[PDB]
Write a protein that binds this DNA or RNA. Structure first.
Lengths: 111, 159, 171, 191
RNA sequence: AUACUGCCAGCUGGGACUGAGGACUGCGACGUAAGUCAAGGAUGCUGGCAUAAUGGUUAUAUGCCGCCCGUCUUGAAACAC
RNA sequence: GCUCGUAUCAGUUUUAUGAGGUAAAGCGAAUGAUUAGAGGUUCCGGGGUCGAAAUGACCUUGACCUAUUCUCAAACUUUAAAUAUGUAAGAAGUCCUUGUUACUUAAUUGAACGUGGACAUUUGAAUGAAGAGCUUUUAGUGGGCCAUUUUUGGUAAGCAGAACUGGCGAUGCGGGAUGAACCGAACGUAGAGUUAAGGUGCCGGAAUACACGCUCAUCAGACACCACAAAAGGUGUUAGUUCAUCUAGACAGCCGGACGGUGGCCAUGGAAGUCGGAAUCCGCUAAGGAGUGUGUAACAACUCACCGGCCGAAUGAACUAGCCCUGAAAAUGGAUGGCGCUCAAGCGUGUUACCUAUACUCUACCGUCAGGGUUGAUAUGAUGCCCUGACGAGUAGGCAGGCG
RNA sequence: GAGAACAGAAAUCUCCAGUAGAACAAAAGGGUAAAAGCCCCCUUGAUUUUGAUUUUCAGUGUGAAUACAAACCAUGAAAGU
RNA sequence: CAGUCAAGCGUUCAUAGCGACAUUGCUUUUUGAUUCUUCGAUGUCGGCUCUUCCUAUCAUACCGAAGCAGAAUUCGGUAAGCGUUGGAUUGUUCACCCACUAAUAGGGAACGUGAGCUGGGUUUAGACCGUCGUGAGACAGGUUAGUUUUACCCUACUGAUG
């Protein structure tokens, strides 16, 4: 994996573009506040920005909101990976591991 | 050819201890076991009657039967692609109380007390345990703690 | 890529028995903040009894060069591992900045001893501006009074494959 | 290590002139003119005041700064040959068979003829380079003098004689026979 | 002041691929009014032809690929059958 | 298929609590090996003396002691990991004059099983759960082989045999030229974009890119698995510690050599030094000795130790490791894949741009699975019509829909 | 180790040290000190009926073993075994 | 087969020529170890014949070095261009002798080469002997006799038209 600390900006972009909820074991695009309210209104999450806020400022219902969010299907990075070989650690000049804050650049490239 | 005996390859397992050989102290006999008690198995090499097998050495089970000088233990043993229930008749010298259950009972009592205090006041007692959280913000001063600069040391043979 | 220099200050994790530990600092030449912190923990593990789990990093700061457009001499003490042993070496170089100084030092080590980044410890980078402190002749050579040299045999790059007059290497 | 600038000074006597095009050196003086090509050296020249010339290499390695002083010495050799000249005196060493040396002309070419070297019926013929003058010096038995301007041709003619007079199938520690160069000096020495 | 990072629910362009669906329904936006819209999937205008022109088949040529099937075998193009 | 419907779950973490005896370590700790070095009554291995006699007397291994670390152990260990591993983290649970019993107790004391009671919006860690509990029945299989890793035998083997694993078989695709297993990535039919591994001089899609070095080979080198090279060497070349000094001047070459009282040590064949011992009396100086070498034995017979002039400011000794070279010999002609490449198109390193997989993103369509909607006066035989979301490799084999 | 008279390095040996360096039928490993060793006294639980359980395991058998029940016994002052 | 280091040998003298104790290696002309290919068969030992290749060079060409005075030798370099025989015995490969020679080097090519030969050997069936076995029979023990097939195809080759 490549992981890191996402920003409010990258999280909002991820949710707005590649944002799909898990409703009755089905992947449905968010695309409207109605279904987010219908599936997460018990927890007070009544909009896509409510869900974004719950994800960013990790809340009491972060687990429920995140599990409602379908896994993000990202593309390959549009500018490449910036390394000749991915499967070394980020420290070693590879890709995998913890790019503490560079995950924003990577994920915004893939998204 | 090949040997697979009852006490095969148990040379160090049942070895008594360093400077703990001989007669066993009486607390092991004074300890009492009830049905449903959770017990660890660690065979005493000195006592050869009612000795557990080397498989059950280090296993934790539940008491299902109590007899004159021994106890019945329920152990789930992995056989192929499933667990089978195994019933052992082990002596109290090889049996010992497990402390995980004791810690959990103490936690149960603590949650009962905290819930009683919540019924008294209502201050969000938050019974459930949580993992180690990431550290919050903190400020580190430099009064008598000015940073000391370190550098990589040059190589020396030292021999 | 471009090396930067970071001051990395970190301490052991404060305990109740000992609040406010000694809070040691290093100067780390690294590509980015993540590698800077990683190298800080590497060297701290090499010197004192602490690791990333048992400690914390209290400050990381880019140290920019004081005058990044002046030419000075740099003495670099390094320690590196060959295919057979560990050796300390001392090299003198000329650059405008310490970070580029260390970058070309790494290039030089790779070119002359096949020493990769992993097998090099930058013991020290010291800036000297006074001559007779420089010891290497390949720097004393450009430390000459009123130095001037030509560049013979100029090769000019052509974007088109075919040229219609025979080239000249005058300069 | 790419020495930035290595230069040497070739001194020019008051009677000789060095005309140097790109890398074609021509030294003229009282005795004659000597020409040398240096296109293989990759060096540069700069005359100072007609009495010194600085030969320089910029940004050269060890093997280039060596060739710089090599060509400085070659120009030394040409100037010295054009001023004073070179004289190679070689003696004849023989135990029993006396070496019989003559100067012969087949189609006018001044070959040196060596006969009776260890008493064999073969005659050893060696040509003479242009500008090399052969003189059977008197007042000393079994001495030959090779004189000229180009030390290269003079020494190569001496070497040609010495090489053609090799002993074969014998112990050359005992059979000391041969023509050996005993003196390398100047035609106009002590003048 | 510029770097360099980060953010913009910032502006201005140049290209390519796709146009699924088909009788009102929804969520929105536009000076808060009837209406409009880029808002639950392309329409508008225009030209040539109406034919072997597009296309199908077929043979060849070209570029790049392509070992002989069946079998037993850990392994078959096999100098295994 | 059945019983149910999000839980009597999990190839995972965390917290708590066990078990282990491998790696390491240890041997002035047990067992067993193992090298050296002081002092011990010789009734207590073997060897001479005051002398007809031994404790009033010394050396040779160490038998037997002294605590001094030279070195070790698969079948040795005090200690002792990492990985792996048992259990628990609740409603079948936690707390009360009690109710039962023939068990148990001296005893309504215990044991087990309970009736009656107090626990809610947090029912007692995290993450996930494209449903959970299985019931019956049956196919093929029961030759395996290959990785990084731990490992046994063997000199080793493309050898033989075992480790948590991942693969090939059974599998195409992109890269490693070529290859069952390596790297990348797994496959419905198409279209755009972006990539992985690998690459970008031409073959060949893609920079004869940019930057710093190193290397010249009269067998260069050229990218893992992998299709090989070593010990030892080299003023080839490159980069890396100490000693003498540096206004008390640092090598190489051209030329010179030396003082006065000293002329004491072997047989009666020979020393101011050459097969030879004792070392301290004085000297104005730019150079001068009771003494440093090649066999006339004796002043004359070939050098020096401080030295001097020369268009004088660093050299001398050892060593380390980069490329290159020597070491480097096999049979048809020949293979960094080929051509070819030398401030490379080689080697080390560092930004970046670019190329392209059946992978990823997004669309169309096909099928499969699943979760649903749908009773309407005719114009529809209700898995009819429709909304959907996910998915698709495959030998042996199973099953289903069909075609003849 | 210090010890007696023959008598001795290895009978007869009184004390002092003695963590087991002994012994426990046998191979090896574990285990054992007012004992599991060595002596002495008693003895036949090496008995009866049938079940449950552990190991190898298919959770089949065989072998071996474990803890009880109901008896009948041995031993001990007894707890117990 | 070839290196590295040199305790020594070589009257002195480690390295002209050697060289112990150690140690680093090189295609497989040995022989093992293995069992991957071939058991609906890849014709087997040797010889004869013939071509080619390797070099770790016996001779010949040219050199370096010697404990090279000369002759004769010995140690090395570039070198496979060119040669490397005739015989007695044995089926032999290897041997071992007689000679000649400039020299009688070592090897590979499916341990080259059986639709090229041969068939002495091995290796069917006949037979004898010795030892073994009660016997039938066994014996890389010895003897003697014992069917060696086909190309007209494609390539390759050699020549020949077109």
């Amino acid at each position: 994996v490549a992981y890191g600390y996402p920003s409010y900006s990258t999280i909002r972009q991820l949710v707005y573009k590649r944002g799909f909820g898990k409703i009755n074991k089905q992947r449905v695009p968010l695309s409207d506040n109605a279904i987010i309210e219908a599936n997460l209104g018990k927890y007070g999450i009544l909009s896509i920005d409510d869900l974004i806020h719950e994800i960013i400022t990790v809340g009491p219902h972060f687990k429920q909101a995140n599990n409602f969010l379908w896994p993000f299907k990202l593309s390959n990075p549009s500018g490449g990976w910036g390394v000749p070989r991915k499967f070394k650690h980020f420290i070693q000049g590879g890709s995998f591991g913890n790019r503490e804050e560079f995950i924003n650049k990577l994920v915004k490239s893939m998204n | 050819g090949k040997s697979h005996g009852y006490r095969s390859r148990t040379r160090y397992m049942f070895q008594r201890d360093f400077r703990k050989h001989g007669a066993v102290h009486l607390s092991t006999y004074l300890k009492v076991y009830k049905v449903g008690d959770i017990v660890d198995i660690k065979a005493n090499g000195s006592i050869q009657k009612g000795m557990p097998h080397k498989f059950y050495q280090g296993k934790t089970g539940v008491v299902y039967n109590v007899t004159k000088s021994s106890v019945g233990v329920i152990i789930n043993k992995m056989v192929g692609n499933r667990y089978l229930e195994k019933r052992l008749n082990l002596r109290v010298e090889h049996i010992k109380h497990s402390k995980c259950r004791q810690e959990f009972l103490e936690r149960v009592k603590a949650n009962a007390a905290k819930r009683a205090e919540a019924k008294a006041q209502g201050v969000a007692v938050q019974l459930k345990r949580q993992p180690a959280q990431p550290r919050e913000s903190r400020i580190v001063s430099t009064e008598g703690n000015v940073p000391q600069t370190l550098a990589p040391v040059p190589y020396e043979t030292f021999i | 890529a471009h090396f930067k220099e970071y001051q990395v200050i970190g301490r052991r994790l404060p305990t109740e028995s000992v609040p406010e530990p000694k809070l040691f600092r290093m100067r780390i030449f690294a590509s980015n903040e993540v590698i800077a912190k990683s190298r800080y923990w590497y060297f701290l593990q090499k010197l004192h009894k602490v690791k990333k789990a048992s400690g914390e990093i209290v400050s990381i700061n880019q140290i920019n060069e004081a005058h990044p457009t002046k030419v000075k001499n740099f003495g670099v003490w390094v320690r590196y591992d060959s295919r057979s042993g560990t050796h300390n070496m001392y090299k003198e170089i000329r650059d405008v900045s310490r970070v580029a100084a260390v970058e070309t030092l790494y290039q030089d080590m790779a070119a002359r001893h096949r020493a990769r980044f992993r097998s090099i410890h930058i013991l020290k980078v010291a800036e000297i501006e006074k001559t007779a402190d420089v010891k290497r002749q390949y720097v004393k050579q450009f430390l000459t009074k009123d130095l001037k040299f030509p560049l013979p045999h100029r090769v000019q790059k052509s974007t088109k494959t075919f040229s219609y007059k025979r080239p000249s290497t005058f300069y | 290590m790419k020495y930035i600038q290595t230069e040497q000074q070739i001194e020019v006597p008051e009677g000789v002139t060095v005309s140097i095009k790109s890398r074609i050196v021509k030294v003229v003086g009282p005795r004659g003119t000597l020409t040398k090509n240096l296109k293989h050296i990759d060096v540069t020249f700069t005359k100072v005041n007609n009495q010194l010339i600085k030969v320089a290499v910029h940004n050269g390695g060890r093997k280039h700064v060596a060739a710089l002083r090599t060509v400085k010495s070659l120009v030394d050799n040409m100037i010295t040959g054009v001023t004073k000249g070179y004289k190679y005196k070689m003696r004849y060493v023989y135990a029993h068979f006396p070496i019989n040396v003559n100067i012969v002309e087949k189609d006018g070419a001044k070959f040196i003829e060596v006969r009776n070297f260890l008493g064999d019926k073969k005659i050893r013929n060696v040509p003479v380079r242009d500008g090399v003058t052969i003189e059977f010096s008197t007042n000393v038995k079994d001495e030959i003098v090779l004189s000229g301007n180009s030390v290269e041709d003079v020494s190569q003619n001496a070497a040609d004689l010495q090489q053609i007079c090799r002993v074969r199938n014998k112990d050359i520690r005992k059979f000391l026979d041969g023509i050996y160069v005993s003196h390398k000096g100047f035609i106009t020495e002590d003048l």
